[PDB]
């Protein structure tokens, strides 16, 4: 049974060199963004007078079309600008800078992967993005900045041509995922290590990607708790580092010999933001 230290050695010995990553909302709570399913703090537990008839409506079309203001309220709160990346994002960035990142798959819509300098080409934003928007009536595309001012101003963005509601290219429930998601067909077989960070893996088809790596490939989980197939049916090369994700990441960074470089990179980063 492999250890965190084992995984560090595989990377240090260059035995593992094509890392794919999967992340969820757990990687953004340390930046101040509360998650979905944590008791008390999680958005699916606590939101009275978010004006939502029940919490899951936030990303449901029927409700959006009946009343889009709750969704744009979350947009106002999450607009790349008012939260910062944290050590978990900088670590991913550092994986890219050191030449280890095959691909980063995120369920998050906070944009903090891009804000931290990970290039779009290394990124699969599986649950969509605010980089762009689409009119819900006439399908004209707009750059995401064209709706920044409306959201700040508390207006519902509308199409200059047809007056329809314009919606960021966020994936709602029932909709399929962006075609970039199809990169998994290539990425997962090519990977020689899988990292899973800050997710409960309760959403599909994103969750199912845990199974798409070969059986000789280690799957490393850094998360408050055991989840998915590391919970119900472990493979022999699975590793769980349970606890706070930033602590799990800080241990790994230490076992890898990257502690000064990390804190360096923050500097040129959280400083220059």
């Amino acid at each position: 049974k492999l250890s965190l230290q084992d995984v560090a050695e595989l990377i240090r010995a260059r035995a593992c060199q094509r890392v794919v990553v999967m992340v969820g909302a757990g990687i953004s709570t340390p930046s101040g963004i509360p998650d979905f399913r944590s008791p008390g703090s999680g958005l699916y537990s606590n939101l009275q007078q978010y004006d939502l008839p029940y919490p899951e409506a936030i990303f449901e079309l029927p409700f959006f079309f009946h009343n889009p203001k709750p969704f744009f309220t979350l947009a106002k709160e999450l607009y790349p600008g008012n939260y910062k990346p944290n050590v978990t994002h900088y670590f991913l960035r550092l994986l890219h800078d050191k030449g280890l990142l095959l691909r980063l798959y995120t369920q998050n819509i906070d944009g903090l992967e891009r804000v931290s300098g990970i290039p779009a080409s290394k990124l699969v934003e599986a649950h969509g993005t605010f980089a762009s928007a689409t009119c819900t009536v006439c399908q004209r595309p707009f750059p995401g900045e064209d709706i920044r001012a409306d959201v700040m101003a508390d207006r519902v963005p509308r199409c200059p041509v047809c007056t329809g509601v314009v919606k960021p290219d966020i994936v709602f429930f029932g909709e399929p995922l962006p075609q970039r998601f199809l990169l998994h067909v290539v990425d997962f077989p090519m990977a020689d290590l899988l990292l899973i960070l800050g997710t409960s893996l309760e959403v599909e088809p994103f969750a199912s990607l845990t199974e798409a790596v070969r059986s000789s490939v280690p799957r490393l989980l850094i998360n408050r708790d055991l989840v998915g197939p590391l919970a119900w049916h472990p493979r022999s090369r699975d590793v769980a580092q349970l606890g706070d994700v930033v602590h799990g990441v800080e241990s790994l960074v230490e076992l890898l010999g990257w502690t000064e470089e990390m804190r360096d990179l923050v500097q040129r980063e959280t400083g220059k933001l």
């Binding site: 709602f172 429930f173 909709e175 399929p176 995922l177 309760e202 959403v203 599909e204 088809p205 994103f206």
Partner: peptide, 8 residues
Amino acid sequence: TRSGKVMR
């Protein structure tokens, strides 16, 4: 077809 975003 059956590849939509859903909770399991």
